[PDB]
Design a protein around this ligand. Structure first.
Ligand SMILES: O=C(O)[C@@H](O)[C@@H](O)[C@H](O)[C@@H](O)CO
Length: 304
């Protein structure tokens, strides 16, 4: 009997967790005569996101959902979070279901990880103690960013002062007045309780964050193809159901946050355009330092 521990950083009521429970775990456990058990560990129980990545690579954490932190080993994996790459949720899903996304996903095997599905965490918004409604308001702003220099660079391009830290440190950084806010999808902002200590939510949607369902290659190579087909069936069902649930749930969460004291700012056309224009410096740099960037972005655009 094979026990597969599956760790992630989201809440047990995040759509990823619900879909893991109902579709991924159940499909595998039932359709393999209970030969595999998929034990779920939400909310950083098995460690923070970076620890999950490392555990997938060394095999001590057999499965997981993470974002794109493996980009610190090979930057190609971080491409999906480049700013303003996708116009909306449906376009993000369409591109992540395309051949180029599959091909980049396959490259994770070189680093010990088998990718099973691209799911959705969502577009990222800025939460803040300070009202932000025009580009000049970023000056002086101290924002936590994730453990990924892309986000450090993004923040600097916005004239924001970033401080990269693990997600588990955000509450205490706010409480200590070390930062003014952070950025993450709407559902994380609710599920985490960050909304209770962040008056303003600014709907920047600057970056789209996928949640990658992954299995350690060390684990995968012990599973015969007949059984892998069942894991793949479960991952495909997980993916369809998770996108659907995530889109539905995000709309609920947006309404919730409107009605519990938070002030949601939808950027003006000018604020929007200023953010978009400011982000171009990131792409200028990608095209200079990555020999694959021109081709990859072209294929991503062709898949839209
Ligand atoms: O804010 C966080 O901690 C996470 O949203 C990120 O670490 C995200 O999962 C990664 O995709 C960022 O590259």
């Amino acid at each position: 009997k094979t026990i597969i521990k599956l760790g992630h950083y989201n809440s047990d009521i995040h759509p990823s967790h619900i879909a893991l429970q109902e579709y991924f775990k159940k499909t595998i456990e039932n359709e393999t005569n209970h030969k595999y058990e998929i034990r779920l560990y939400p909310n950083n129980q098995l460690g923070g996101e970076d620890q999950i990545v490392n555990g997938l690579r060394n095999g001590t954490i057999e499965a997981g959902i993470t974002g794109l932190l493996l980009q610190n080993v090979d930057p190609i994996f971080g491409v999906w979070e480049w700013p303003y790459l996708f116009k909306d949720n449906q376009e993000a899903k369409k591109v992540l279901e395309s051949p180029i996304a599959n091909k980049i996903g396959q490259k994770m095997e070189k680093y010990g990880i088998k990718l099973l599905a691209y799911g959705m965490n969502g577009f990222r918004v800025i939460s803040s103690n300070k009202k932000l409604e025009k580009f000049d308001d970023f000056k002086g702003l101290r924002l936590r960013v994730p453990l990924n220099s892309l986000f450090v660079d993004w923040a600097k391009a916005m004239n924001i002062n970033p401080q990269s830290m693990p997600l588990s440190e955000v509450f205490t950084a706010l409480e200590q007045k070390v930062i003014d806010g952070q950025e993450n999808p709407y559902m994380l902002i609710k599920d985490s309780g960050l909304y209770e200590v962040q008056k303003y939510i600014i709907q920047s949607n600057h970056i789209f964050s996928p949640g990658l369902l992954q299995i350690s290659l060390k684990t995968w190579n012990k599973i015969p193809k007949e059984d892998q087909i069942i894991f793949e069936k479960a991952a495909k069902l997980y993916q369809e159901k998770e996108w659907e649930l995530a889109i539905k749930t995000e709309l609920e969460v947006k309404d919730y946050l409107a009605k519990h004291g938070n002030e949601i700012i939808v950027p003006s056309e000018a604020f929007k355009n200023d953010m978009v224009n400011a982000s171009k410096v990131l792409y200028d740099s990608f095209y200079k330092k990555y020999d694959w960037a021109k081709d990859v972005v072209q294929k991503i655009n062709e898949a839209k």
